Amino acid sequence: DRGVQMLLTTVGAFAAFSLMTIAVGTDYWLYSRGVCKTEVMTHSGLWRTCCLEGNFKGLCKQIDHFPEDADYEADTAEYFLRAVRASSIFPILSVILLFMGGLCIAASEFYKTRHNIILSAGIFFVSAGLSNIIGIIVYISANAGNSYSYGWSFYFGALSFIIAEMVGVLAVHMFIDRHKQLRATARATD
Amino acid sequence: DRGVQMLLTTVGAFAAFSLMTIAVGTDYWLYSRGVCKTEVMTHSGLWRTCCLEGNFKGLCKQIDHFPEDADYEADTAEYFLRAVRASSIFPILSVILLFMGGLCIAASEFYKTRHNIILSAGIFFVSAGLSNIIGIIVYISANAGNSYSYGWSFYFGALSFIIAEMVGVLAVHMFIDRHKQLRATARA
Amino acid sequence: DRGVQMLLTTVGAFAAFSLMTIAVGTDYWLYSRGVCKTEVMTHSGLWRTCCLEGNFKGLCKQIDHFPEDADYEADTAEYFLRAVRASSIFPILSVILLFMGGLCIAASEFYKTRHNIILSAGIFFVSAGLSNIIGIIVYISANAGNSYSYGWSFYFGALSFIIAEMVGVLAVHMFIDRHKQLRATARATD
Amino acid sequence: DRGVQMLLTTVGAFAAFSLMTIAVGTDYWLYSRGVCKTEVMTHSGLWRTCCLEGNFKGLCKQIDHFPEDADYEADTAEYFLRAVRASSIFPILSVILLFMGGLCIAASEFYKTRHNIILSAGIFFVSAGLSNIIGIIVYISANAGNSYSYGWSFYFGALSFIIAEMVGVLAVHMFIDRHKQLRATARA
Amino acid sequence: KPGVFSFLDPLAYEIWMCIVFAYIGVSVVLFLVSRFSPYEWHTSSESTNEFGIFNSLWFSLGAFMQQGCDISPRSLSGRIVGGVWWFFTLIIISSYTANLAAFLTVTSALSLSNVAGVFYILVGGLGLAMLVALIEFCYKSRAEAKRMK
Amino acid sequence: PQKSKPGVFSFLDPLAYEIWMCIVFAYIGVSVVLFLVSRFSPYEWHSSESTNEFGIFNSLWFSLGAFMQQGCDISPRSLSGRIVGGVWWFFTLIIISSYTANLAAFLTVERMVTSALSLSNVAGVFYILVGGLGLAMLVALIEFCYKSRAEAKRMK
Amino acid sequence: PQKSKPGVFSFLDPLAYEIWMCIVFAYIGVSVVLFLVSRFSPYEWHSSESTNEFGIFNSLWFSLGAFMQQGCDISPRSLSGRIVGGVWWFFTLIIISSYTANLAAFLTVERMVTSALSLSNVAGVFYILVGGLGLAMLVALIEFCYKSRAEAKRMK
Amino acid sequence: KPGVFSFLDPLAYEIWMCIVFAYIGVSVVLFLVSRFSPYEWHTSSESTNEFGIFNSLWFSLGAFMQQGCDISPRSLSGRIVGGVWWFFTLIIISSYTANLAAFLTVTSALSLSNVAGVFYILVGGLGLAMLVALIEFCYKSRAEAKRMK
Ligand SMILES: [Cl-]
Ligand SMILES: [Cl-]
């Protein structure tokens, strides 16, 4: 079943990484009323907003992450939230951590003797899920700061978080199984 | 006592089935003010409403489950609630589950070796109680769609739920005891 | 410590009975503004109200437990509360139960072999405390149904409840000790 | 390590005593708006208020603990709170308890056989922390009698409370270990 | 004019009745899913859990009463029952508290006349418990006496 | 004529004094009845110990925990004990909900004789807490001292 | 144009849908992290069993109990597990207080499309409960059936 | 404009600071009254209770958080500490909930922006916990290194 567990871990890691990468790259995060010219229904992601339907359909414009005049930067929380949202540092960090976990899984497959690689993969997947959570919260909060809906990229990211957490649990289970087998073999040989 | 427990289970099953059957078929679920022709003290059940006083006493009229005069249609969820109330699907399901639990009790009575029949009877009675709960909630919620009181058919249904739950507990206890005896025989 | 426990039980039983009897008999339950003629400061108990100070000091009048006109005998809770308050059935029942517990203790002193008398005394004292609680609640509720204070008879009743509960605990402890000694003697002799 | 634990306890005791002593004697408990003669940004301590800016900068005036101009006396409870605040009885008691706990710590160096001295030091430090808490609450409540902020003298007292509690925990641990060793030697 | 049981006002009478019915149903279902299977019994044999019908009723009451108990379901079906009962309890108790705050804010101190009903219920429950304990003790004493003969 | 701030013990304001007295009496009565129904019967006893842990001190502790919405490490197992526990739980639910409905509003009533709660408004809560701590310390110390003396009497 | 009564799922009204989604995600993440910090280290392991009972299923159960203001039969003992539990407890306190502040008012909002709460206003709470019961029954039955089949495979 | 930590608004900053101080003091006093006496230790010897400083802090946090824990004080002084902490927790948490209900009704659904701060704290705590665990693991692993040479 260990082989089945490894296959599930690899498939889930790849699926979560692909879903997160597609969610970050694509721009179907939010359907809302707005203007894509640089008010009609538009779909927007982390970087671009594009009109759908109408006569200007297909035109995309970069999202203005630092809007409004007079640039009221007296406070720090608003500027920090705007900067974090503009960089999208947490979704990209989740993507990077998912890639690192997949790399750790592959390296452990190559080695099959250093159990700490499995633990590192599990830690990477759990941290990727946490980064996904933080990025989702930051994105929604920045959207708050007029009927809207969430697109399939947003739910791709949510499913990526779910799958990353499941794969992290599986990797921790494999690490525990490896150490238990090592202890049992040590007991048997002595 | 296995015989006493079986007798109590059978008596409770019959009593709960009779109480739910009477509650479903009688017209004393609620007392309110209304008309039994085409405002006066009236008693209603699941299907018909009958006037209690006045000149039109004793005349029963079928309940308008989908009125088109003071409501003229409504939302989809409200229509679904009205359909569930009109069919009385959950009280009737409770009656059917109580009947099937009683038949399971009888089948186990003439099938001593089959222990899973006791378990089936217990499951049927517990599910009958749950269906009783759902039917009660559906009926009360549909009535919400200014003085009213519940009649003895409603409380007959409530008592049927209580007795069905107790009989389910007794049946599960009998099943547990039967498997205890089986494992004791296996050990010895 | 058995003799000390019995002495404490007897002293507490007598004290609680005396305090409850004084509280029920005396009329310093409530100081409030009112009229003792059949508005000045008056003191009232469970049966009588008497003016203090002024020129009509010392005159006592029986409390009107069924006041108001038109005799609105429509509901049942108000009439029941008024009747229970007028009879003072619960303070008197607490007095009777305290007397019964003291009698049980005295009877158990003569016998010293029937342990169920100690248990009966403990049950009587606990029930007397419960009756005291119910009577206090009924009295306060009927008073509710304009600045007032509670007199020393009220606090005599409260202290009677406290002492009755303590004596009930002591009596249950003595019953437990007697049964434990019986079991230990049975084990030793067999 | 017994020596390391004793060194940490001594260092923490001295640090907490110094922090509370500085907090009691300094005049940077609060920053507010007031007058240091007989409205301007100013800093206040337990005893004196000094103007921070303006023409009257650098002039300290004793705090009017019982004002009779804009308050014209108060209730008994308010007077008691004002007296407790004016005496600074609880911060000073915390200082005294920290000092006495430090002396208890030092006393055991030449009284290594006496274990109750460590327990006394721990009790003194814990009580000093509790007195710190009471003094902080009294000071804040008396200040309630529209902008302000607390200065480093206030947070010096807060840190003194934290360190006193930690040193009390360490002293109790040392006492427990000493009695552990005593019972181990008694066993063997 | 609020009665002695005006503390039940924030919820309708149908809500209280259905709360009782739901409590009974949840207790029965918890006991059933905990004890019906012979595979939960180890070798009279003993169960792998303590969730008999009486203990199931106690656990359900404790969960609804914001108190808890000394046992907790461990199987999947038992934990499903417990979690759904927890959700029901959270919603219902929160609704009762919010509606009770609304009812009370119609700041004057609460009078004893508004809680006399709950005091009466408490004392009646204490008396009932004492009666039950006394009957159990008397039955056991009679059993011992007839055994000694 | 300045507005009178709530007192140091203003946390008792939401309930009348009679309610507090009856709460204390009900707590005592429930603890006593729980101990009685848990410990009186010799058939609950096995040197010899009880089948349950509900002595008078433990019953008082359990009742206090139930009223404080906290719980403890023990729970009644018998029918009579569970009746006491359940009725006390219902009483606690009703009383605590009624008390905590408007507690913050009761803590800031300025009297002639939305804002954040201030420390003053809850200062009395802290004092009692610290008092309790001090009391407990004293009690612990006394016990230790007592035992020490006894050990001396055992060492001679 | 009659006023629209709250839906069956009106108990979700006090919080936005995004809050509910983030609550589910936070619950999953906290359970996973608690299991990880409780079970990953071989030094927490003694056939061989762990020093603690915080497997993934038990971690999910503990997290659900903490969020439901209920508790369970286990509690984290290690530093990291207690950090997880304490931060989840703080989150639960904040979120549950915010949700239950105005729940009854949210359950009776008549919309354009003090009174006792009616059964209809909480009917959706009951249905789910019964649904859960049914689901649990099904699950239990399935397990039994499965085991029965396995027993037959053992009997051959 | 409420910030990300607007859920702390119902209580003043001094109240939060004194809550932290009181929590520390209660935990320390509970540990002291539970463990200082050699008469509470039985024969390294073991204590009659599990109320070390770490477990005392855990018990105090659980009591304040409306969650509880797996241990409860049994001595008189420990139960005095626990009961007074229970009283403090009841008053303070009830006050916070009442003032938060007042603050939130200044019925519109709560937005994620109003609570996002608490989410941040949660995630931060999780990260911290993981870090701690990893650190501990490393400290054992390197130890095993010097245990394998
Ligand atoms: Cl984009
Ligand atoms: Cl009189």
SS3 assignment for chain F: CCEECCCCCHHHCCECHHHHHHHHHHHHHHHHHHHHHHHCCHHHECCCCECCCCCHHHHHHHHHHHHCCCCCCCCCCCHHHHHHHHHHHHHHHHHHHHHHCCHHHHCCCCEECCCCECCHHHHHHHHHHHHHHHHHHHHHHHHHHHHHHHHHHHHC
- Do G71 and G82 have their domain in common? yes
Judging contacts by C-beta atoms under 8 Å, the chain A residues touching residue G45 are: 176, 179-180, 183
- Do H27 and H90 have their domain in common? yes
Q: Which residue of H has its CA nearest to F58?
A: H74
Judging contacts by C-beta atoms under 8 Å, the chain G residues touching residue H124 are: 87
Q: Which residue of A has its CA nearest to G30?
A: A130
Helices assigned H by DSSP within E36-75:
53-64
In a domain, A166, yes or no: yes
Q: How far is the CA of A136 from the centre of ligand 1 (A)?
A: 14
Helices assigned H by DSSP within chain G:
17-39, 56-67, 79-100, 103-106, 123-155
3-state secondary structure of D73: coil
Tell whether H115 lies on the interface with A, counting CB pairs under 8 A: no
Residue G25 in contact with residue A133, Cβ under 8 Å? yes
- Do H34 and H60 have their domain in common? yes
Judging contacts by C-beta atoms under 8 Å, the chain F residues touching residue H80 are: 132, 135-136, 139
Specify the number of domains making up chain G.
2
C-alpha span between G108 and E10 (Å, rounded): 13
Contacts of A among chains (3+ CB pairs under 8 A):
G, H
Cβ neighbours of residue E42 closer than 8 Å, sequence gap 6 or more: E48
Beta bridge partners of H47: H41
C-alpha span between B27 and B36 (Å, rounded): 13
Specify the number of domains making up chain A.
1
- Residue contact D133–F130, C-beta within 8 A: yes
Q: Give chain D's end-to-end CA distance (angstroms, integer).
A: 22
Q: How far is the CA of C49 from the centre of ligand 2 (A)?
A: 7
The DSSP code for H40 is G
Which tokens hold the place of G145?
A: 């059936």
Judging contacts by C-beta atoms under 8 Å, the chain C residues touching residue E119 are: 133-134, 137
Q: How far is the CA of C139 from the centre of ligand 2 (A)?
A: 12
Torsion of Cα atoms, B8 then B9 then B15 then B19, to 10° = 140
Deposited experimental method: cryo-EM
Q: Which of H39, H68, H89 sits opposite F71 (nearest CB)?
A: H68
Which tokens hold the place of C8?
A: 């404490």
C-alpha span between H128 and G33 (Å, rounded): 11
Torsion of Cα atoms, F82 then F87 then F90 then F92, to 10° = -100
Nearest to E110 by CA among E31, E2, E12: E2
Q: Which residue of E has its CA nearest to C120?
A: E134
Q: Which of G7, G118, G134 sits opposite B130 (nearest CB)?
A: G134
Judging contacts by C-beta atoms under 8 Å, the chain D residues touching residue H53 are: 169, 173
C25-43 burial, b at 16+ Cβ within 10 Å, e below that, comes to: ebbbbbbbebebeeeebbb
B137-to-A160, B148, G121 alpha-carbon distances in Å: 40, 16, 11
Which tokens hold the place of F124?
A: 């009395």
Residue G86 in contact with residue H60, Cβ under 8 Å? no
- Residue contact E98–G99, C-beta within 8 A: no
3-state secondary structure of C28: coil
Q: Which of C126, C137, C180 sits opposite F33 (nearest CB)?
A: C126
Question: In this structure, which amino acid lies at residue D82?
Answer: R
Beta-strand relationship, D60-62 and E41-42 = unpaired
Element at B49 (helix H, strand E): strand B48-51
Residue D109 in contact with residue D6, Cβ under 8 Å? no
Q: How far is the CA of C87 from the centre of ligand 2 (A)?
A: 12
- Do E98 and E144 have their domain in common? no
F43-to-C143, C188, E21, H50 alpha-carbon distances in Å: 45, 19, 34, 32
C-alpha span between C59 and C47 (Å, rounded): 14
- Do F142 and F156 have their domain in common? yes
- Residue contact A136–G48, C-beta within 8 A: no
F37: containing domain: 3-113
Q: How far is the CA of F84 from the centre of ligand 2 (A)?
A: 34
Q: Residues H1-7: contacts with CB within 8 Å, 24+ apart?
A: H2/H114, H3/A77, H3/H117, H4/A77, H4/A141, H4/H113, H4/H116, H4/H117, H4/H120, H5/H117, H5/H118, H6/H114, H6/H117, H7/G94, H7/G98, H7/H100, H7/H114, H7/H115, H7/H117, H7/H118
SS in 3 state form for G108-142? CCCEECCCCECCHHHHHHHHHHHHHHHHHHHHHHH
Nearest to D31 by CA among D155, D148, D174: D148
Question: In this structure, which amino acid lies at residue B55?
Answer: N
Contacts of D among chains (3+ CB pairs under 8 A):
F, H
Interface residue ranges in chain E relative to chain F, Cβ cutoff 8 Å: 7, 54, 58, 61-62, 65-70, 93, 96-97, 100-101, 104-105, 107, 109-112, 114-115, 118-119, 121-126, 128-130, 132-133, 136-137, 140
D130-to-C8, D9, D124, H61 alpha-carbon distances in Å: 39, 18, 10, 19
- Do G69 and G145 have their domain in common? no
Beta bridge partners of D43: D31, D50
C-alpha span between A42 and C150 (Å, rounded): 74
Nearest to D24 by CA among D114, D69, D88, D86: D88
CA atoms within 13 A on the CB side of C149: 7
Element at C48 (helix H, strand E): strand C48-51
Beta-strand relationship, D30-34 and D40-44 = antiparallel
In a domain, B68, yes or no: no
User: CATH code at E98?
Assistant: 1.10.287.70
- Do E86 and E60 have their domain in common? yes
B169: containing domain: 2-26+75-187
**B171 C-beta neighbours (distance < 10 Å), count:** 31
C-alpha span between C113 and E64 (Å, rounded): 46
Q: Give chain E's end-to-end CA distance (angstroms, integer).
A: 61
Which DSSP string corresponds to B113-157? Answer: S--HHHHHHHHHHHHHHHHHHHHHHHHHHHHT----EE-HHHHHH
- Chain F, 49 to 108: residues with Cβ < 8 Å from chain C are 56
In a domain, D128, yes or no: yes
Distance from CA of C176 to the nearest CA of F (A): 6
- Do H123 and H68 have their domain in common? no
Length of chain A: 190
- Do F81 and F108 have their domain in common? yes
Indicate which of F2, F4, F111, F119 best probes the interface with D, i.e. most D CBs within 10 Å of its own CB.
Answer: F119
Chains C and A touch (3+ CB pairs under 8 A): no
In a domain, E119, yes or no: yes
**A130 C-beta neighbours (distance < 10 Å), count:** 29
Q: How far is the CA of C30 from the centre of ligand 2 (A)?
A: 10
Question: In this structure, which amino acid lies at residue C147?
Answer: S
CA-CA-CA-CA torsion sign (C109, C110, C115, C121): negative
Cβ neighbours of residue A126 closer than 8 Å, sequence gap 6 or more: A164, A165, A168, G29, G32, G33, G36, H130
Q: Give chain C's end-to-end CA distance (angstroms, integer).
A: 27
Residue C101 in contact with residue C10, Cβ under 8 Å? no
- If 0-12 CB within 10 Å is exposed, 13-18 middle and 19+ buried, where does residue F41 land? buried
User: CATH code at D10?
Assistant: 1.20.140.150
Judging contacts by C-beta atoms under 8 Å, the chain B residues touching residue E22 are: 133
C-alpha span between F73 and F65 (Å, rounded): 10
Angle between helices B89-109 and B2-25 (to 10 degrees): 150
**G112 C-beta neighbours (distance < 10 Å), count:** 7
Vertex H43: Cα angle to H42 and H49 (nearest 5): 30
Residues with CB under 5 A from ligand 2 (ion): C 27, 45-48
- Do F107 and F150 have their domain in common? no
Indicate which of B130, B139, B177 best probes the interface with E, i.e. most E CBs within 10 Å of its own CB.
Answer: B130
- Do E54 and E95 have their domain in common? yes
> What values do phi and psi take at G61, rounded to 5?
-65, -45
In a domain, D51, yes or no: no
F91-103 burial, b at 16+ Cβ within 10 Å, e below that, comes to: bbbbbbbbbbbbb
Element at C44 (helix H, strand E): strand C40-44
- Do G124 and G98 have their domain in common? no
C-alpha span between H93 and F100 (Å, rounded): 9
3-state secondary structure of D33: strand
H136-to-A169, G37, G38, G85 alpha-carbon distances in Å: 20, 10, 12, 18
Distance from CA of F111 to the nearest CA of C (A): 18
Find the ligand nearest to C27 CA.
Answer: 2
In a domain, H1, yes or no: no
φ/ψ region of B77 (left if φ > 0, alpha if ψ in -120 to 50, else beta) reads alpha
C-alpha span between A103 and D157 (Å, rounded): 52
C-alpha span between B125 and B112 (Å, rounded): 20
The DSSP code for E111 is P
> What values do phi and psi take at C61, rounded to 5?
-130, 135
Judging contacts by C-beta atoms under 8 Å, the chain A residues touching residue G25 are: 133, 136, 158, 161-162
Residue B20 in contact with residue B132, Cβ under 8 Å? yes
3-state secondary structure of C39: coil
Which tokens hold the place of F99?
A: 């008390």
In a domain, E1, yes or no: no
Residue with tokens 């009917």: G123
C-alpha span between F145 and D187 (Å, rounded): 23
Question: In this structure, which amino acid lies at residue G1?
Answer: P
Residue A117 in contact with residue A111, Cβ under 8 Å? yes
Q: How far is the CA of C81 from the centre of ligand 2 (A)?
A: 18
C-alpha span between E134 and F41 (Å, rounded): 9
Q: What is the largest CA-CA distance in chain H?
A: 68
